[PDB]
Coordinates of C-alpha atoms and ligand atoms in Angstrom, one line a residue:
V1 CA 20.9 1.5 -1.6
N2 CA 19.0 3.2 1.3
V3 CA 15.6 2.1 2.4
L4 CA 13.6 5.0 3.6
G5 CA 9.9 5.3 4.5
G6 CA 7.6 6.8 1.9
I7 CA 9.9 6.3 -1.1
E8 CA 8.9 4.6 -4.3
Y9 CA 9.5 1.0 -5.0
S10 CA 8.6 -1.1 -8.0
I11 CA 7.1 -4.6 -8.0
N12 CA 8.2 -7.0 -10.8
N13 CA 9.2 -3.8 -12.8
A14 CA 5.4 -3.3 -13.4
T15 CA 3.7 -1.4 -10.6
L16 CA 4.7 1.1 -8.0
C17 CA 4.0 1.4 -4.2
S18 CA 5.6 3.2 -1.3
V19 CA 7.9 1.9 1.4
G20 CA 6.2 1.8 4.8
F21 CA 8.9 1.3 7.5
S22 CA 12.3 -0.3 7.7
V23 CA 12.3 -3.3 9.9
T24 CA 14.6 -6.2 10.9
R25 CA 13.8 -9.9 11.6
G26 CA 16.7 -11.7 13.2
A27 CA 19.7 -10.9 11.1
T28 CA 17.5 -10.1 8.0
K29 CA 16.7 -6.6 6.8
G30 CA 13.4 -5.6 5.3
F31 CA 10.5 -3.2 5.2
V32 CA 6.7 -3.3 5.9
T33 CA 4.2 -2.3 3.3
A34 CA 0.7 -3.1 2.2
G35 CA -0.3 -6.6 1.2
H36 CA -2.2 -5.5 -1.8
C37 CA 1.1 -4.2 -3.3
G38 CA 2.3 -7.6 -4.5
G39 CA 2.3 -11.4 -4.1
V40 CA 4.8 -13.5 -2.2
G41 CA 8.1 -13.7 -4.1
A42 CA 7.5 -10.7 -6.2
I43 CA 10.7 -8.8 -6.9
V44 CA 11.2 -5.4 -5.4
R45 CA 13.5 -2.6 -6.7
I46 CA 14.4 0.7 -5.1
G47 CA 16.0 2.9 -7.7
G48 CA 15.5 0.4 -10.5
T49 CA 18.0 -1.7 -8.5
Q50 CA 16.9 -5.0 -7.0
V51 CA 16.8 -5.0 -3.2
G52 CA 14.7 -8.1 -2.4
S53 CA 11.2 -9.7 -2.6
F54 CA 7.9 -10.0 -0.8
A55 CA 8.5 -12.4 2.1
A56 CA 4.9 -12.7 3.4
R57 CA 1.6 -10.9 3.1
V58 CA -2.1 -11.0 4.0
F59 CA -4.6 -9.4 1.6
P60 CA -7.6 -9.1 1.7
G61 CA -9.0 -9.6 5.3
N62 CA -6.0 -7.7 6.4
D63 CA -3.7 -5.5 4.2
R64 CA -0.1 -6.1 5.2
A65 CA 3.2 -7.4 3.9
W66 CA 6.9 -7.3 4.5
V67 CA 9.7 -7.3 1.9
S68 CA 13.0 -8.8 2.8
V69 CA 16.1 -6.8 1.7
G70 CA 19.6 -7.9 0.9
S71 CA 22.3 -7.4 3.5
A72 CA 24.2 -4.9 1.3
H73 CA 21.4 -2.3 1.6
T74 CA 21.1 0.3 4.4
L75 CA 17.9 0.7 6.4
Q76 CA 17.0 4.2 7.7
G77 CA 14.7 4.5 10.7
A78 CA 13.0 7.5 9.2
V79 CA 10.5 8.6 6.6
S80 CA 11.0 11.0 3.7
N81 CA 9.4 14.4 3.9
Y82 CA 9.6 14.8 0.1
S83 CA 11.5 18.1 0.5
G84 CA 15.0 16.7 0.8
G85 CA 14.7 15.8 4.5
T86 CA 13.5 13.0 6.8
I87 CA 11.4 12.5 9.9
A88 CA 12.9 10.2 12.5
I89 CA 10.9 7.1 13.5
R90 CA 11.1 6.6 17.3
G91 CA 8.6 3.9 18.1
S92 CA 5.1 2.7 17.3
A93 CA 2.8 4.1 20.0
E94 CA -0.7 4.2 18.6
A95 CA -2.4 7.6 18.4
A96 CA -6.0 8.3 19.3
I97 CA -8.8 9.8 17.2
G98 CA -8.3 13.5 16.8
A99 CA -4.5 13.3 16.9
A100 CA -2.4 14.8 14.1
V101 CA -0.8 12.4 11.7
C102 CA 1.1 12.6 8.4
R103 CA 1.8 10.1 5.6
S104 CA 4.4 9.8 2.9
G105 CA 4.2 8.2 -0.5
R106 CA 5.4 8.5 -4.1
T107 CA 2.2 9.9 -5.7
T108 CA 1.1 12.8 -3.4
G109 CA 4.3 13.1 -1.3
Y110 CA 4.2 14.2 2.3
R111 CA 0.6 15.1 3.5
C112 CA -0.9 15.7 6.9
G113 CA -4.2 15.5 8.6
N114 CA -5.8 13.9 11.7
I115 CA -6.9 10.4 12.8
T116 CA -10.7 10.3 12.4
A117 CA -11.9 6.7 12.9
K118 CA -10.9 3.2 13.9
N119 CA -12.0 -0.3 13.0
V120 CA -13.3 0.6 9.6
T121 CA -14.0 -2.1 7.0
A122 CA -13.1 -1.3 3.4
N123 CA -15.0 -3.2 0.6
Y124 CA -12.3 -3.6 -2.0
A125 CA -13.0 -5.4 -5.2
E126 CA -10.7 -8.2 -4.2
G127 CA -12.4 -8.5 -0.8
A128 CA -13.2 -6.8 2.5
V129 CA -10.4 -5.6 4.7
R130 CA -11.3 -5.1 8.4
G131 CA -9.9 -3.1 11.2
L132 CA -8.5 -0.2 9.3
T133 CA -7.8 3.2 10.9
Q134 CA -9.0 6.3 9.0
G135 CA -7.4 9.7 8.7
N136 CA -8.1 12.7 6.6
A137 CA -4.6 13.4 5.1
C138 CA -5.0 13.0 1.4
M139 CA -3.5 10.3 -0.8
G140 CA -3.6 8.8 -4.3
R141 CA -2.9 5.7 -6.2
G142 CA 0.7 4.8 -5.7
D143 CA 0.9 6.0 -2.1
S144 CA -0.2 2.4 -1.2
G145 CA 2.0 0.8 1.4
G146 CA 3.5 4.1 2.5
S147 CA 4.2 5.4 6.0
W148 CA 1.6 6.9 8.4
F149 CA 3.3 8.5 11.4
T150 CA 3.0 11.2 14.0
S151 CA 5.2 14.3 13.8
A152 CA 7.0 13.1 17.0
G153 CA 8.0 9.9 15.1
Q154 CA 5.5 7.3 16.2
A155 CA 4.8 4.9 13.3
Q156 CA 1.0 4.3 12.9
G157 CA 0.6 2.1 9.9
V158 CA 0.8 1.6 6.1
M159 CA -1.4 3.1 3.4
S160 CA -4.3 0.8 2.4
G161 CA -6.9 2.7 0.4
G162 CA -9.6 5.3 0.5
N163 CA -12.0 7.5 -1.4
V164 CA -10.0 8.4 -4.4
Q165 CA -11.8 10.7 -6.9
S166 CA -11.7 10.6 -10.7
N167 CA -8.2 12.1 -10.7
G168 CA -6.8 9.1 -8.7
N169 CA -6.5 10.9 -5.4
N170 CA -8.6 12.6 -2.7
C171 CA -6.4 15.8 -2.5
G172 CA -8.9 17.7 -4.7
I173 CA -11.5 17.7 -1.9
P174 CA -11.3 19.2 1.6
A175 CA -10.0 17.0 4.4
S176 CA -13.5 16.9 6.0
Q177 CA -14.7 14.9 2.9
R178 CA -11.8 12.4 2.9
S179 CA -11.5 8.8 4.0
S180 CA -7.9 7.6 3.9
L181 CA -7.4 4.2 5.4
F182 CA -4.3 2.6 6.8
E183 CA -3.4 -0.8 8.3
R184 CA -2.1 -0.5 11.9
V185 CA 1.6 -1.3 12.1
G186 CA 1.5 -3.0 15.5
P187 CA -0.2 -6.2 14.3
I188 CA 2.2 -6.5 11.3
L189 CA 5.3 -6.3 13.5
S190 CA 3.7 -8.9 15.9
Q191 CA 2.6 -11.3 13.2
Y192 CA 5.9 -11.5 11.4
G193 CA 8.3 -11.0 14.4
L194 CA 9.6 -7.7 13.0
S195 CA 11.4 -4.9 14.8
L196 CA 11.0 -1.3 13.7
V197 CA 14.2 0.4 12.8
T198 CA 14.5 3.7 14.7
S199 CA 16.8 6.7 14.6
Ligands
CL1 CL1 21.2 -1.3 7.5
CL2 CL1 -9.1 6.4 19.6
CL3 CL1 -11.2 -1.5 -5.2
CL4 CL1 -0.4 -0.2 15.7

C-alpha cells in the first residue's frame, strides 16, 4: 500500500493516529509520527493491512516516533489534502512565528493556520513534553502524529496535542483561541538517522 502523510493508521487494531511523513533509514522504509501514538513493537496497519511496527519512540519529554514499513509498500513524499489530492514535501526548512502552516490528519482533515509560538511545554497526564511549536490551525483527537507543513512543502513537525474542547477538537472556536502543538521534525530525523522522502 501507499504511505502518505496525514492518512489514518491503526495501532494494534485498537487506536487510530495519522501518518506524519514518509522517511527512509538505510535501506529501510518508514514514517515519522508522534511517540504517544504507540509503544515500541506495536503493529501498524494502513488500510486494515499490516505495514510494519513502531521502531522507536520518545514520550513524554519529547513526543516522537518512527514506524518501520515493509519493503513491499510504497512511500510517497507528500501529504494528503483530504480532497483527493496531495501536497508535495520538498524539505524540512523550519518556519518562523507568523508563517502560514497547514496540517493533515484523519479526524479534522486538512486545516490551516499560522505558527504562533515556540518552545512550549505541554503538561500531559503521562508527563510534560517540552520544546513544542504552537500553531492555530485546528485539530482533534485522532489527528495525533499527523503532518504539519508549509504550503511550499517544508515539513515542520508531527501533531502532539492541544486545547481540545468537549467535542474532542478545537475547530469549534476561532483560531485566535487555539493552541495546537507539534513536535519539530528536525530533531526526529536527526535522532533516528532518518531521511525525509520528497517529491
Ligand atoms: Cl517506496
Ligand atoms: Cl520564530
Ligand atoms: Cl492529557
Ligand atoms: Cl524541525
